[PDB]
């Protein structure tokens, strides 16, 4: 990553689209000393531009990225108590404690705002917060039912890994065509209708007694914070989330078409702290659809007033540990003594 000699596929234009994806030309150390060859390069986001002060490129010959069930068990002389109470206040009164040696197996789903895959509630929809008054604390809303979300990114890339040199291992993406729209997704709404209604129901049966509930979109920040940043197999998807949060729920009473969400695939993500960026460099093949079950909501409340006669709720998140509390909610490792 130094400088990129990029161009655009636009020969006539409307809306000043530019491009998130660009097919570019480069100068590349191949073999020996100081030889180069003309090489294709793609950048997800004209000359230069590069990367900012770090770039790890994952790639690799044999890998992939799909969450795999991982069980957490207690050792010898240790147990794990487990609240099987369907209605838990989170800080509170639990009647049924059991002790398992090992969990059923938890899947490592890295996402924000919605839980994808994950676990469902046994009885009704359950809302959970560390401090229902403190708006800075997250609200893990667990569903008894999944809201659909089908994501088809029909962007196409052909894998070419040129092994020109010993230390060097280079890829080449950006072949062919197909004119795929960005990367695309859908959320299926009937579930979303009943679920959101029931959520405002739970909210109004908890802290919200008599209030009109409104849901505005993300408040702003890093691309991982503004969009529903999740992964479809190692590429980082970012979705405009207005379609999920654009409904004003009337306190008076309740009030085939599917919701289609605009998404983008990224290669350059920022893992860890800033020790380095991570790239999934050769997205292989094309036309890859991931069907998911919306198992969740992570919310932060917009501190409002009482003269507004309404309560506003915004998508929050970021620390995946919240997602694990949303998963590791019924496990606490304990030890036994005579």
């Amino acid at each position: 990553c130094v400088t990129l000699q990029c161009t655009n596929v636009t020969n006539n234009i409307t809306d000043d689209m530019r491009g998130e994806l660009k097919n570019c030309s480069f100068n590349m150390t191949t073999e020996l000393r100081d030889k180069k060859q003309k090489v294709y390069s793609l950048f997800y986001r004209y000359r230069l531009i590069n990367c900012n002060t770090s770039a790890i490129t994952q790639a690799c010959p044999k890998v992939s990225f799909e969450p795999i069930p991982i069980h957490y068990c207690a050792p010898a002389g240790f147990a794990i108590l487990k609240c099987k109470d369907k209605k838990f206040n989170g800080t509170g009164p639990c009647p049924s404690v059991s002790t398992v040696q090992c969990t059923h197996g938890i899947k490592p789903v890295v996402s924000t705002q919605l839980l994808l895959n994950g676990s469902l509630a046994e009885e009704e929809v359950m809302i959970r917060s560390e401090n229902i008054t403190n708006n800075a604390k997250n609200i893990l809303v667990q569903f008894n039912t999944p809201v659909q979300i089908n994501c088809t990114r029909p962007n196409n890339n052909t894998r070419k890994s040129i092994r020109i040199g010993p230390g060097q291992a280079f890829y080449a993406t950006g072949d062919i065509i197909g004119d795929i729209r960005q990367a695309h997704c859908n959320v299926s709404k009937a579930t979303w209708n009943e679920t959101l209604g029931k959520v405002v129901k739970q909210l109004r049966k908890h802290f919200g007694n008599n209030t009109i509930i409104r849901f505005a979109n993300s408040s702003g920040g890093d691309l991982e914070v503004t969009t529903h940043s999740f992964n479809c197999g190692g590429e980082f998807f970012y979705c405009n989330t207005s379609g999920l949060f654009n409904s004003t729920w009337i306190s008076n009473t309740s009030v085939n078409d599917s919701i289609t969400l605009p998404c983008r695939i990224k290669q350059i993500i920022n893992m860890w702290q800033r020790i380095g960026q991570a790239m999934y460099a050769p997205p292989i093949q094309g036309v890859i659809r991931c069907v998911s079950n919306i198992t969740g909501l992570i919310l932060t409340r917009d501190g409002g007033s009482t003269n507004s006669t309404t309560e506003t709720f915004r998508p929050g998140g970021g620390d995946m540990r919240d997602n694990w509390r949303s998963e590791l909610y019924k496990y606490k490792v304990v030890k036994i003594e005579p």
Partner: antibody
Framework: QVHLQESGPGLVKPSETLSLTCNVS????????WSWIRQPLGKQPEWIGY???????NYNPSLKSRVHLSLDKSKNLVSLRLTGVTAADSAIYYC??????????????????????????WGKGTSVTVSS | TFVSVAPGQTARITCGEE??????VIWYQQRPGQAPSLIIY??????SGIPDRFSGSPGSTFGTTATLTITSVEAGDEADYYC????????????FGEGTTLIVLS
């Protein structure tokens, strides 16, 4: 029957303005898109532009500054003017009626939606030689 | 270019660049001494008076060229043929594709 008949001077001097008329019968001009198309000797057709009473009108970019298309509803005709002609503008010129179609997919493919035009009725053509 | 064929046999004519996006191809037939006349619109749709001997290749598989097929060719089919390509990733084409002359060796 829809019937178009082009007329023009046959001969134009270099730098002069070419003025052509397309007389229309069997339909009213306001009710159609009308496209002028040109075809030089021994070459493929080269279109010119399309015009509609609605204002939904567009010109070949290469001819943009030199071309004007009009509809005359009172006389039921379509007109073309092309300024600053040269030998390169020598061709048979045709008046036609231009229909519009859309390629429509799923919303997942919205960026790939597009409109296309096809010329379904042609006149007999008028020959234009720009020479001195 | 040129394509020659015997009466009764099948002729095929290629026109335009390889496809990039989704396509709507228009085909026109022009007889000698006549104005251009059409043949097909919307890749495989025919206007009034055109028989099903004439067919166009779908606006489909990416990176391929549009083709007009004429089955059971007769001497009346001898003419110049032109396409006008609409491709979702390309600018409006203001020039028709280069023509092909069909010769029927009667």
């Amino acid at each position: 029957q829809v019937h178009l008949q082009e007329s023009g001077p046959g001969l134009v001097k270099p730098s002069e303005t070419l003025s052509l008329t397309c007389n229309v019968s069997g339909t009213l001009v306001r009710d159609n898109y009308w496209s002028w198309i040109r075809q030089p000797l021994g070459k493929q057709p080269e279109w010119i532009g399309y015009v509609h009473d609605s204002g939904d009108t567009n010109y070949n970019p290469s001819l943009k500054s030199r071309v004007h298309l009009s509809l005359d509803k009172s006389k039921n005709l379509v007109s073309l003017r092309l300024t600053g002609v040269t030998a390169a503008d020598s061709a048979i010129y045709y008046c036609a009626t231009t229909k519009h179609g859309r390629r429509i997919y799923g919303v997942v493919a919205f960026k790939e939606w597009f409109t296309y035009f096809y010329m379904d009725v042609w006149g007999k053509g008028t020959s234009v030689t720009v020479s001195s | 270019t040129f394509v020659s064929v015997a009466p009764g046999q099948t002729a095929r004519i290629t026109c335009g660049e390889e496809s990039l996006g989704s396509r709507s191809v228009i085909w026109y037939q022009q007889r000698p001494g006549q104005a251009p006349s059409l043949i097909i619109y919307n890749n495989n749709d025919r206007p009034s008076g055109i028989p099903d001997r004439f067919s166009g290749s779908p606006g489909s598989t990416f990176g391929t060229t549009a083709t007009l097929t004429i089955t059971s060719v007769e001497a009346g089919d001898e003419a110049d043929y032109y396409c006008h390509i609409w491709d979702s990733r390309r600018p409006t084409n203001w020039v028709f594709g280069e023509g092909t002359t069909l010769i029927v060796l009667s």
